[PDB]
Amino acid sequence: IPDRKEAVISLWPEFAKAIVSGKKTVEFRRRIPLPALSARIWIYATRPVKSVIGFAYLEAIVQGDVNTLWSRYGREAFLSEQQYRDYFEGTEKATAFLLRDHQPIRPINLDQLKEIRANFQPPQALTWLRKEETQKLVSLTS
Ligand SMILES: [Cl-]
Ligand SMILES: [Cl-]
Ligand SMILES: [Cl-]
């Protein structure tokens, strides 16, 4: 049973790159199941990259009102007010993940990930990694 110190998240490639390059230090999600505070977040870029391209660490978790969060962290989130607004339409509470110590790596493609976890689907929210899985992911890291 995973302890949520190791997790994977899915982003579109432009946002995934902004993160592994240290540009985007905030990720907004709805109220989803939470990682551990001290977690490594491995960053999975969707099509056409279809790879894990780095990781980053979680310096803080913020939940609160949608307007407040944009006002406070929206610039660090690298998306536009419109995108944020369309996404959080229909809810009043958001989650902000504050990120630090980003690390670009060379891409671990989707085939290698199904080699580590047989039925890997790219996470709609976060997926927690097993111990055995983390070791393999790390082994491929470069
Ligand atoms: Cl959701
Ligand atoms: Cl709500
Ligand atoms: Cl709620």
Instruction: Find the DSSP H helices in 50-116.
Output: 66-73, 81-87, 110-116
Rounded Cα distance between 76 and 43, Å, is 17
The technique is X-ray
8 Å CB contact between 39 and 8: no
Q: How far is the CA of 142 from the centre of ligand 1 (A)?
A: 32
The ligand whose atoms approach the alpha carbon of 91 most closely is 2
Residue closest to 31 by CA, chosen among 129, 126, 132, 135: 126
Say which residue the tokens 């047989």 belong to. Answer: 118
Rounded Cα distance between 65 and 45, Å, is 28
16: enclosing H helix or E strand: helix 13-20
Q: How far is the CA of 31 from the centre of ligand 2 (A)?
A: 8
Amino acid at 15: F
Phi, psi dihedrals of residue 47, rounded to the nearest 5°: -55, 140
Query: Cβ neighbours of residue 112 under 8 Å, at least 6 residues apart?
Result: 140
8 Å CB contact between 64 and 94: yes
The structural domains of the chain, with segments of one domain joined by +, span 1-142
Structure tokens at 95: 């989650």
Say which residue the tokens 């990120």 belong to. Answer: 99
Q: How far is the CA of 63 from the centre of ligand 3 (A)?
A: 10
Ligand 1 is an ion; residues with CB less than 5 A from it = 30
